[PDB]
């Protein structure tokens, strides 16, 4: 019982946090895009695309993608997992992160990788 | 009398990508399109974000972004141009392309740059 935060709530807090950080002289928020029936599919909209797009290359990666879950009792779907694998294979940092604190932590760690070098990973294995 | 709509232009480009291959699968699989207003903005939706996201790094670029216009008489908004500048600055290939043929030609030239080398420009 007692429900946790909704996913909309988790994402909104993360965005509000990003408005208070800076990257290259502007709010980090400016570098974050959220990609929110049959027509959309033929228009190219991909089911299970990660919630957050961060268009900055750092360390080993060409960009950052985050699939947000509201808490630890929510799980990525097969389409989300497949899209994450496709992104990783193409050299993007693409991860599931659950809850506000973990999403913020990933964004912090990603930026902290430093300038693109094609080498520095988020984790030992990925 | 009116030319093609932007929806129709984008759909033809997507249908074209379905018939192209990249690393064993349709090029279409690598293309993403991101489609009250206040809520979406505080959720992080950026007005003026390019229509087409291609999550492949080629030549000098970390990825490809295309702002589509339906024909030669249509032009980028200030927000669209600002986003394009931000993308280019971070090492993405970000362009305005107008009409079906030009959009397809940009995708063709981008893929042809080859594997990411950090130097080969469009
Ligand atoms: Mg999610
Ligand atoms: Mg457009």
Author numbering:
A (entry chain E): 4 to 39, 59 to 148
B (entry chain A): 5 to 39, 58 to 144
List sentences from the manuscript.
psNUC was solved by SAD and refined against 2.0 Å resolution data. Here, the crystals contain six molecules per AU, comprising three dimers that, like those of saNUC and stNUC, form around a central hydrophobic β sheet interface. In particular, the linker between β1-β2 forms a partially structured extension over the active site surface. Hexacoordination of a magnesium ion is seen at each active site, involving the E-PD-EXK motif and two water molecules in a configuration stabilized by the conserved Q102. The active site surface is bounded by a ring of positively charged residues to allow substrate recognition. PsNUC bound a four-way DNA junction stoichiometrically with an affinity indicative of a subnanomolar equilibrium dissociation constant (KD) typical of HJRs (∼1 nM; White et al., 1997) whereas stNUC bound the junction over 100 times more weakly (KD = 200 nM). We next investigated the catalytic activity of the VRR-Nuc domains toward these DNA substrates. Figure 3C shows the cleavage products obtained with psNUC and Jbm5, a four-way junction that can undergo 12 steps of branch migration such that each possible dinucleotide can be accommodated at the branchpoint (Kvaratskhelia et al., 2001). psNUC therefore not only structurally resembles an archaeal HJR but also behaves as one, displaying binding to and symmetrical cutting of HJ substrates with affinities and cleavage patterns typical of a canonical HJC protein.
